[PDB]
Structure 1
């Protein structure tokens, strides 16, 4: 509103994005009904299908925009291939900060690792989460954009995570009164949002620790240098930090 009018003039990084979309992204207007569109900007509710060059140019500008503030509503739809974009709107009992301790993280890392074992296999853990300061506390979002398994296979993964009780006690270790129902049944089939995109009447999320692990076919049980937005994004198969697992 009033704030959004300010960034359009005061600063030029948003203005830089405006020039790119008016000329380059303009020709890539895509119908909303079709699923071919990969970019859905909620600033104006428009769907865009961008190729790799148009995507990466869009991604690159996004990080600089976040470093200088501003507000954005850019979203990307969940496609037929993506990483573990599994939102967890954890409705805690109270707004008590549960620390993402590496011991507790390894509990979550290994259990979600266990779930992806009983599926198609031959791992970058992006622990983005809500800035909190709201009733119902934050929404944890682990993302593994390297792999390409965004199909009904993830629905079995969705069911396994939802039916999982091992993660439940780990969330119970965090003081969460909602161990499940945080993972929506359509977590890996509904449009997602690029890291740093502001939400409807809510601030953009932040990433706690963007760590990673390694997976081996024979033995399964094993940051300011990359553009964050593309790295967390699922479509970026040509990613530098991430690789198309």
Structure 2
């Protein structure tokens, strides 16, 4: 733990400079809030990944803010008491359905862009409920656009059919309706009494405004070869694999 303590004091000395005053990151272990600029987020995520690779206990939260990446928090009750299979072919269709509502939102920028979907599930169940996040960290959109996509996915009959076929006993009440507001847990961190979400697989989706009908979805190879906490952050913009796709958003109106 010696090398973990060295990083913990390093984080404390590098983030104390950004202590909130009369907010994007919360350290629930220490109860201190910080206002980090985007230029300094990559160094922060670089230090967390070091602590993650050593199994350090951390509990950092990331406020989704008004304009950031999209997260979908599912809390599913399964037909059996075992964790969901979540085969790659099933999650690929989920990506397609999620993207159909993204394209229909009319916020995507012009040109060719790479979208990355990430699926992390909770290791153990809480109150008989299993959960998994669908992180689209590089695709930055407004909070209202997230509520539109979330509301559409709640009524998406195709998504409900897939979940029910996988054994989900609550396909209509599993998607958190407040997914656009809850802070995103950084990858390696979790509550003291709960295990951290583990990344199963990610998918790469290439989209071109020229040909909108061609939507190839391929699985990501060597995801663990990247700074996972940085690639999965909804507010990171300096990732290597995940490159930001800035969607249309009225910044000020979205805050008001």
The interval holding the TM-score normalised by the smaller chain is 0.7 to 0.9
Q: What is the total number of aligned residue pairs between the two structures?
A: 231
Q: Is the 8 A contact 1:195 1:232 kept in 2?
A: yes
Give the Cα–Cα distance (whole angstroms) in 2 for the partners of residues 237 and 120 of structure 1: 22
Q: 1:133 aligns with which of 125, 131, 141?
A: 125
SS at match of 1:170: helix
User: Larger relative CO (CA 8 A, sep 6+): 1 or 2?
Assistant: 2
Aligned partner of 2:248 in structure 1 is: none
Contiguous gaps of at least 5 residues in structure 1: 1-10
Cα distance change, pair 14–27 in 1 and its aligned pair in 2 (3 A):
same
Shift of the alpha carbon at 1:75?
0.6
Which digits, 9 at most, give the CA deviation of each residue in 1:72-107, with x for residues without a partner? Answer: 110100112222211111122432332221221122
TM-score, L = length of structure 2: 0.83
Shift of the alpha carbon at 1:171?
0.4
TM-score, L = length of structure 1: 0.87
Give the Cα–Cα distance (whole angstroms) in 2 for the partners of residues 14 and 43 of structure 1: 15
Aligned partner of 1:22 in structure 2 is: 12
Which digits, 9 at most, give the CA deviation of each residue in 1:140-173, with x for residues without a partner? Answer: 1111111111321211112111122211110011
Runs of 4+ in 1 over 3 A off after TM superposition: none
- Most deviating of 170-179 and 121-130: 121-130
SS at match of 1:144: strand
Q: Is the 8 A contact 1:94 1:135 kept in 2?
A: no
- Most deviating of 185-194 and 98-107: 98-107
Q: Is the 8 A contact 1:25 1:54 kept in 2?
A: no
The structure that is strand-richer by fraction is 2
Q: Is the 8 A contact 1:98 1:174 kept in 2?
A: yes
Cα distance change, pair 221–66 in 1 and its aligned pair in 2 (3 A):
farther
Give the Cα–Cα distance (whole angstroms) in 2 for the partners of residues 120 and 225 of structure 1: 34
Q: What CA RMSD, in Å, does the superposition of the two structures yield over aligned residues? A: 1.8
Which digits, 9 at most, give the CA deviation of each residue in 1:179-217, with x for residues without a partner? Answer: 132221110122111111122510111000022111111
Q: Is the 8 A contact 2:92 2:203 kept in 1?
A: no
Give the Cα–Cα distance (whole angstroms) in 2 for the partners of residues 13 and 164 of structure 1: 47
Which digits, 9 at most, give the CA deviation of each residue in 1:15-45, with x for residues without a partner? Answer: 132222332211211159xxxx111111022
1:102 aligns with 2:88: yes
